[PDB]
Every structure is written in structure tokens, then in C-alpha cells.
Design a protein around this nucleic acid. Sequence first.
DNA 1: GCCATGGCTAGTA
DNA 2: CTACTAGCCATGG
Length: 108
Amino acid sequence: MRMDEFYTKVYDAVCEIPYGKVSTYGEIARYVGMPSYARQVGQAMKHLHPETHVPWHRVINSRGTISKRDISAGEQRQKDRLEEEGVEIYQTSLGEYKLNLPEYMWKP
DNA sequence: GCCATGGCTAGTA
DNA sequence: CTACTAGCCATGG
């Protein structure tokens, strides 16, 4: 399965997720049948054009945190796009962001 | 061939 | 609960 294919398959999927609900890199990685590949899922979400009509924000790590991203300081962007979804978000004095996973976790 | 680098994850302290 | 190691694997220099 050549890249671009995979790239599509993933996208088709993140359009599948419902408002408010969410998934992780781990999970989409296996959903499309390519489990060893979340790494390449962050990868796919990075490759997105910002004014995309895709729930790029509804995908976090398995720890149920927001990931770093660096070259988009406004990784923060991902948060508020989600409070615009009814999801309560906090942190630690580690000052990350976290959430009640098995609640909002997208169970298909 | 080499390395290093990511929006990762799971295991094990 | 954090904290660190190992694997993981595309992309680019």
C-alpha cells in the first residue's frame, strides 16, 4: 500500500469521527489496518492545509494529551477548537492538556 | 549505506 | 502519577 493511499484512507476516517467525540493516533493507525503506523498519522495531520475541512483537531495521543507539534506553537489551536465542542480540558503543574479519555473516546 | 527527526505507543521502573 | 527506554517507520539531508 503506497503512501498517498494510506494518506487518503486516514483522512476518509477522520471525517468519520463525530462532533465532540475523538480518537488517537494509535487507534486510526490500526483502524485502516496499519497498526504500526501512528507515527505516520501525526505525519499525516501535519501535512494538512489549515483551512482544511477535516477534524484534524479530534486526534490526540494514547495518553489522551495534546501533542507538541513545535513548528506550530499554536498547537494550542487544537485545544480551543475542542472547547468549541463541549469538552472540558485541564492540565497539571506539568501544564499539559488532558482529558477524560474513555468518556469522549470514539468507540466505533 | 549513513544519520537524525517527528502532532506515537507501550512497557517497565 | 511521572520518567525514562525500546521499539517503531516515513521523510529528508
